[PDB]
Amino acid sequence: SFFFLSFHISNLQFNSSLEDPSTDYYQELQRDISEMFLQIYKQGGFLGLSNIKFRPG
Amino acid sequence: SVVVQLTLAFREGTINVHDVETQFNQYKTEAASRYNLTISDVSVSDV
């Protein structure tokens, strides 16, 4: 099943690069988050990250 | 800061939205300690 997850980060600021997945910062950021998430959900229920979208906060 | 909205996929009959909030909120500090990331708040909906 799929769930909708939303959150805000202060460690990073909104960047034009993040306003477009055409940048490595955006792609890596997803990965870093995906990597970090895998640590939180190690329970195994985790499957992967999909349909990511970023926005200014 | 940045507001991110995505879709998180979990196995069915394994983890509930309630459990997700529990680990994520509990991991906000530790997951943050490991990656040095800062989170303001998290929200998970099944709809």
Curated annotation (Swiss-Prot), chain A:
How does it get modified post-translation? Answer: Highly glycosylated (N- and O-linked carbohydrates and sialic acid). O-glycosylated to a varying degree on serine and threonine residues within each tandem repeat, ranging from mono- to penta-glycosylation. The average density ranges from about 50% in human milk to over 90% in T47D breast cancer cells. Further sialylation occurs during recycling. Membrane-shed glycoproteins from kidney and breast cancer cells have preferentially sialyated core 1 structures, while secreted forms from the same tissues display mainly core 2 structures.
What's the superkingdom here? Answer: Eukaryota
* Annotated tissue distribution: Expressed on the apical surface of epithelial cells, especially of airway passages, breast and uterus. Also expressed in activated and unactivated T-cells. Overexpressed in epithelial tumors, such as breast or ovarian cancer and also in non-epithelial tumor cells. Isoform Y is expressed in tumor cells only.
Q: Which residues are glycosylated?
A: 15
Task: Write out the annotated subcellular location.
Answer: Apical cell membrane
Subunit: The alpha subunit forms a tight, non-covalent heterodimeric complex with the proteolytically-released beta-subunit. Interaction, via the tandem repeat region, with domain 1 of ICAM1 is implicated in cell migration and metastases. Isoform 1 binds directly the SH2 domain of GRB2, and forms a MUC1/GRB2/SOS1 complex involved in RAS signaling. The cytoplasmic tail (MUC1CT) interacts with several proteins such as SRC, CTNNB1 and ERBs. Interaction with the SH2 domain of CSK decreases interaction with GSK3B. Interacts with CTNNB1/beta-catenin and JUP/gamma-catenin and promotes cell adhesion.
Q: What does this protein do?
A: The alpha subunit has cell adhesive properties. Can act both as an adhesion and an anti-adhesion protein. May provide a protective layer on epithelial cells against bacterial and enzyme attack. The beta subunit contains a C-terminal domain which is involved in cell signaling, through phosphorylations and protein-protein interactions. Modulates signaling in ERK, SRC and NF-kappa-B pathways. In activated T-cells, influences directly or indirectly the Ras/MAPK pathway. Promotes tumor progression. Regulates TP53-mediated transcription and determines cell fate in the genotoxic stress response. Binds, together with KLF4, the PE21 promoter element of TP53 and represses TP53 activity.
User: What other remark does the UniProt record contain for this protein?
Assistant: The name KL-6 was originally that of a murine monoclonal antibody reacting with pulmonary adenocarcinoma cell lines and pulmonary epithelial cells. This antibody recognizes a sialylated carbohydrate chain on MUC1.
Query: Would you tell me the protein name for this molecule?
Result: Mucin-1
**Organism annotation:** Homo sapiens (Human)
User: Taxonomic lineage of this organism?
Assistant: Eukaryota, Metazoa, Chordata, Craniata, Vertebrata
Gene coding for it? MUC1
Curated annotation (Swiss-Prot), chain B:
Q: Which residues are glycosylated?
A: 36
Q: What is the annotated localization of this protein? A: Cell membrane; Cytoplasm; Nucleus
Known outcome of mutating residue 19 to A: Greatly reduced formation of isoform 5/isoform Y complex
Q: What is the protein's name according to its record?
A: Mucin-1 subunit beta
Q: Which organism is the protein's source?
A: Homo sapiens
**Lineage of source species:** Eukaryota, Metazoa, Chordata, Craniata, Vertebrata
